[PDB]
């Protein structure tokens, strides 16, 4: 007999703790949350590591049906895509070597900044300093961090849980996180869909069900070791 077909879900699995590779498998908070959500939604699915810029290209062509990849909901992105209700709150931070004199975002003036291409961190860097060669763009956040380590850049702007977990997992790298609430906005992550997707409603209801049952907090505690503040998801 005929058919799956499965929902095709894309991701950039180079963004621990949300999605990353471990032993040939894609793991992480977004991975576990997606499984809970799609199961609650009664949707069969496949999760594919397609990379960040390809993910957006493939959503536009509808080769991929859905994405989950630590993606900030933004007004500009809503022009081209649809988002689920938010499932996480985050902010950009600055990642530097210990020893850096940087105390806030404004201290990055005249310095070289590494970011992942087409991210809200690239956006924040361009908003603060204008577009130019001092902003170095990489296809993964992993490579951005590598360019911090080897001195190719002076600082990286990326998401708080990603920077924090990198430092906590890599003490011997002697990096540090600088937070700047005055210069960086609150951000909310959403699952993402091609415009006019018939999956969004099912995913929104499933996410509600996952949060309501305590499954969201079990997953959150697995990855972060503390309770979430669920009231952040109703802002
Ligand atoms: N949350 C930021 C960074 C995500 C990058 C994930 N590879 C954004 O949506 O642009």
Would 2 be classed as within a structural domain? no
Domain membership flag for residue 232: no
State whether 118 and 80 are in the same domain: no
Here the CATH number for the domain that contains residue 60 is 3.40.190.10
Same domain, 73 and 121: no
Strands 175-178 and 135-138, how do they pair?
A: unpaired
Which atom of ligand 1 is nearest the CA belonging to 118?
A: 10
* Structure-solving method: X-ray
Together in a domain, 95 and 113: yes
Same structural domain, 100 and 182: yes
- Among 161, 179, 202, which residue's Cα sits nearest to residue 72? 161
Q: Which atom of ligand 1 is nearest to the CA of 52?
A: 7
Chain centre to alpha carbon of residue 224: 15
End-to-end CA distance of the chain: give it in Å, rounded.
46
Do both 119 and 198 map to the same domain?
Answer: no
Query: What is the number of the ligand 1 atom nearest to the C-alpha of 18?
Result: 6
CA atoms within 13 A of residue 36's CA, in its CB half-sphere: 23
Backbone φ, ψ for residue 103 (5° rounding): -110, -20
Residues in Cβ contact with 110 at an 8 Å cutoff, skipping those fewer than 6 apart: 134
Answer whether residue 123 is part of any domain. Answer: yes
Atom of ligand 1 nearest to the CA of 116: 5
Q: Please check whether residue 209 lies inside any domain of the structure.
A: yes
Domain that holds residue 98: 90-187
In this structure, the residues whose C-beta lies within 6 A of any atom of ligand 1 are: 12, 15, 52, 69-72, 116, 119-120, 141, 159
Instruction: Give domain status of residue 197, yes or no.
Output: yes
Q: Of 87, 89, 159, 184, which is best to mutate to test ligand 1, by the most ligand atoms within 8 angstroms of its C-beta? A: 159
Residues 132, 208 share a domain = no
| Distance of alpha carbon 74 from the chain centroid | 13
Nearest to 115 by CA among 77, 154, 76, 87: 154
Torsion of CA 62, 68, 73, 79, to 10 degrees: 0
Tell me the H-state helices in the chain. 29-40, 52-61, 75-78, 120-129, 141-149, 160-169, 200-212, 215-224
Q: Report CA(3)–ligand 1 centroid distance (Å).
A: 34
Ligand 1, atom 3: closest residue by C-alpha? 119
Residues 182 and 214 occupy one common structural domain: no
Phi, psi of 45 (to 5 degrees): -155, 165
Q: What CA–CA distance (Å, rounded) separates 72 from 6?
A: 25
CA distance readout (Å), 199 to 9, 12, 43, 203: 11, 20, 9, 6
Handedness of CA 76, 122, 161, 18 (dihedral sign): positive
Which residues are within 8 A (CB) of 112 and not within 5 positions of it... i.e. 6 or more apart?
134, 135, 136, 152, 153, 154, 155
Number of domains in the chain: 2
Residue bearing the CA closest to ligand 1, atom 6: 70
Contact 147, 138 (CB under 8 A): yes
176 part of a folded domain = yes
């Amino acid at each position: 007999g005929a058919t799956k077909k499965k929902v095709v879900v894309g991701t950039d699995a180079a963004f621990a703790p949300f999605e990353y590779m471990q032993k040939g498998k894609i793991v992480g908070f977004d991975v576990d949350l997606l499984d809970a959500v799609m199961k609650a939604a009664g949707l069969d699915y496949e999760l594919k590591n397609i990379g960040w810029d390809p993910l957006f290209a493939s959503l536009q062509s509808k080769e991929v049906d859905m994405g989950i990849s630590g993606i900030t909901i933004t007004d500009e992105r809503k022009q081209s895509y649809d988002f689920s209700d938010p499932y996480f709150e985050a902010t950009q931070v600055i990642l530097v070597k210990q020893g850096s004199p940087v105390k806030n975002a404004l201290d990055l003036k005249g310095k070289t900044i590494g970011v992942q291409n087409a991210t809200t961190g690239q956006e924040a860097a361009e908003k603060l300093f204008g577009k130019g060669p001092h902003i170095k763009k990489f296809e993964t956040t992993v490579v951005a961090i590598m360019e911090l380590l080897n001195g190719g850049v002076d600082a990286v702007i990326t998401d708080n849980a990603v920077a924090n977990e990198y430092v906590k997992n890599n003490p011997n790298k002697k990096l540090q996180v600088i937070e700047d609430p005055k210069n960086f906005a609150s951000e909310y992550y959403g699952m993402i869909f091609p415009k006019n997707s018939e999956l969004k409603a099912k995913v929104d209801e499933a996410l509600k069900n996952v949060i309501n049952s305590g499954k969201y907090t079990e997953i959150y505690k697995k990855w972060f070791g503390k309770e979430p503040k669920l009231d952040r998801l109703k802002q």
